[PDB]
Write a protein that binds this ligand. Structure first.
Ligand SMILES: NC(=O)C1=CN([C@@H]2O[C@H](COP(=O)(O)OP(=O)(O)OC[C@H]3O[C@@H](n4cnc5c(N)ncnc54)[C@H](OP(=O)(O)O)[C@@H]3O)[C@@H](O)[C@H]2O)C=CC1
Ligand SMILES: NC(=O)C1=CN([C@@H]2O[C@H](COP(=O)(O)OP(=O)(O)OC[C@H]3O[C@@H](n4cnc5c(N)ncnc54)[C@H](OP(=O)(O)O)[C@@H]3O)[C@@H](O)[C@H]2O)C=CC1
Lengths: 398, 396
């Protein structure tokens, strides 16, 4: 077996909890031994520990640099009643993101025989937004001037901008800000992401409206690029380029994918089971990977009733491969790195060979026309993945 | 005899849409409807020659007559100023008109059974109304205080909020506002939109974060619904509900369309995107296509090259305006004609006759053959033939 090293694992809820264990038993543990720091973020354990397990897991990722998380229940009124919760606990992902900070990158796994939004997309597209509300909103009770002013610490200037003169009645108003350091982090993660995946980085803004707000982003990116990054980019045939929201969307419809897209926003096509997410810290050392979808409660309800389920494990699987990939990069572990990529290859190869779960079959043929013989159920698909994994690894040996 | 349509304000536009606009009036409207046409030429040359006076006048006419249908217009930039030697960079005509009329813009894509849509589970299009810029942004060069103050006009105590204290480094800051009247109008237009279409209404905000800012939207929407629209909504078996933006995106993706989405704050064929400005009064509306003047196709047409521009959005501007005019005047004949024009457009495409953009949505642009679509004039002639036939069969 491979010596994988230190990995922080977080267990989840409902259907993903089941798939998670299938992944560990069929795909990971037979080939990788890990110094595994496992945390049970199941809803009942989070309630029992008064959410302490969530904080402990966050600190564990901070210490060991690699975290892979299963989907978790974010409680609401119904969940509080269903589980007899003591509190409507905050989402584990919010707690973890707030402890680690960083930038989230979403990337949908592409298979040739699965329709994409843009027919021409051959390579993936990695979209990134910064994990930051810290905004001061208030009620304007009646007529009067709302103004926003800046005063430098040296007190040599004072600038006052009229936000609005309320002359008929009141309303609402707010102010919000952004620190340079937070914009710089967003850019560092974004450039390191483009270098890691070996693709070009595009930044899109709306400088035609918030000329000053978005212009600061444009400048901070260009500064960092031309300073510490331009070199590596020209080396790998990649580059950085700023785009307006229109020029960017256009360049995407005509493009073949294969680029990082940084957004200053203030999730659709392709089954949710194909979407991956990665929290990348500015330091470039810490990564937390996980599927972009949820616990799949509906499929779990079928399971509980004893009905066949067909749940896509790809996003969950790619959470492990990304985490193991980063762990291998940190440890210079060529064997683990080879495994992580082999597992990714096998998943796509199996789907592209026609073995797939119902969601993907529906994407191809349309749900009203899918037949039982068009797909595999949850356990059949995991079986096929494990079978092709064993073949692939053994064949690589020769 | 033709139908007596009444008073309509019409606004002529630029480039490709101007060509198609005239074909629409000649082939689909005028052969069947007589209008008291208040017609204004918002072509770039006429706006310049009148110093944009025509644009303001058109807005006043809509205010007076309640119904307006507008062709897409060139919004000037530096390149347009050079191309036409403009006296100056005239403001977007839509900006002038919205400023004069107020109201909320609602966007709706026209759904054809045989054109693939974003979520294949959307049977009926979804109508999205948006709010408004009005953001005072600026750069923070270095350490210092950014504060936002409220100064009452009656002399009482000034109120000051800290936005942020930049202790080291700089960044950016911005201020933003919303007047209560503005939110009330947004709600009223939205409720009227939902009643008119007979569909449910959903307001999406982030009132859990912006507790006071977005909370004001949700509160005003609810108070106006309970006092002015609850019963009417029930009398049509519809409803209004607030929803957090995340939950709303969830409900929408699993839904089959058919609802109005008001959100404070999408890639189909632009040729199928419709737009309507709905004033809160419930009387005045202005309809236009969601796309622009299609300059690229116009350059083709200028060199005598074959074009295939989609007129659907332009056609639905006319049908929505005429439908509102019919409602205002209790004009059963015009109401039917407007419905017939919309169905004939949908049916022609659903029968396999379409412009190149929709053929691309089916075969993909790389494999679109000339025999897969009609050019602009071929498609317009096909619509005319089918409209003629439908209206003949409608007598009995
Ligand atoms: N990262 C996290 O921890 C996340 C937490 N959640 C939690 O999970 C639950 C969400 O349930 P829901 O709102 O249904 O969102 P889910 O993403 O859990 O399920 C959404 C729906 O999309 C389809 N789908 C999603 N993942 C898969 C998959 N792997 N294979 C096949 N189909 C899939 C299914 O639709 P169909 O049944 O039509 O196939 C499923 O019902 C809540 O408790 C929420 O708090 C949700 C989001 C993220
Ligand atoms: N309501 C208004 O008055 C509006 C004004 N404008 C003005 O109009 C011009 C806009 O030009 P542009 O920026 O190209 O935006 P357009 O929407 O005019 O053209 C956009 C592109 O989308 C496709 N497209 C749009 N409408 C159609 C259609 N009816 N049938 C087929 N394809 C269509 C074409 O792409 P392809 O050529 O690849 O098919 C077209 O080149 C500018 O002068 C702008 O100021 C723009 C926005 C709204």
């Amino acid at each position: 077996k491979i010596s994988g090293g230190s990995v922080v694992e977080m267990q989840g809820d409902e259907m993903t909890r089941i798939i998670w264990e299938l992944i560990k038993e069929k795909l990971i543990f037979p080939y990788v031994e890990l110094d595994l720091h496992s945390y049970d973020l199941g809803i009942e354990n989070r309630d029992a520990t008064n959410d302490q397990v969530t904080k402990d897991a966050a600190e564990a990722i901070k210490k060991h640099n690699v975290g892979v998380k299963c989907a978790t229940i974010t409680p609401d009124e119904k969940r509080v009643e269903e589980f007899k919760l003591k509190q409507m606990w905050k989402s584990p992902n919010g707690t973890i993101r707030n402890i680690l900070g960083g930038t989230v990158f979403r990337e949908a796994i592409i298979c040739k025989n699965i329709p994409r939004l843009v027919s021409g997309w051959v390579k993936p597209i990695i979209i990134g937004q910064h994990a930051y509300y810290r905004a001061t909103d208030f009620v304007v009770p009646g007529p009067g001037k709302v103004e926003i002013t800046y005063t430098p610490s040296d007190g040599t200037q004072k600038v006052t901008y009229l936000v609005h003169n309320f002359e008929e009645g009141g309303g609402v108003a707010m102010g919000m800000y952004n620190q340079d350091k937070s914009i710089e982090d967003f850019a560092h993660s974004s450039f390191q992401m483009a270098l890691s995946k070996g693709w070009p980085l595009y930044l899109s803004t709306k400088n035609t409206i918030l000329k000053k707000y978005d212009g600061r982003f444009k400048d901070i990116f260009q500064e960092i690029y031309d300073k510490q990054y331009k070199s590596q980019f020209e080396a790998q045939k990649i580059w950085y380029e700023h785009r307006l929201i229109d020029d960017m969307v256009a360049q995407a419809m005509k493009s073949e994918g294969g680029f990082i897209w940084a957004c200053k926003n203030y999730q659709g096509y392709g089954s949710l089971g194909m979407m991956t997410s990665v929290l990348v810290c500015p330091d470039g050392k810490t990564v937390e990977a996980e599927a972009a979808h949820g616990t799949v409660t509906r499929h779990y309800r079928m399971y509980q009733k004893g009905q066949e389920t067909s749940t896509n494990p790809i996003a969950s699987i790619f959470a492990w491969t990304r985490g193991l990939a980063h762990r291998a990069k940190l440890d210079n572990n060529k064997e683990l790195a080879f495994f992580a990529n082999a597992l990714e290859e096998v998943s796509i190869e199996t789907i592209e060979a026609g073995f797939m779960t119902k969601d993907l079959a529906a994407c191809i043929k349309g749900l009203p026309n899918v037949q039982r013989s068009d797909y595999l159920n949850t356990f059949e698909f995991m079986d096929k993945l494990g079978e092709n994994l064993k073949i692939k690894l053994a064949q690589a040996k020769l």
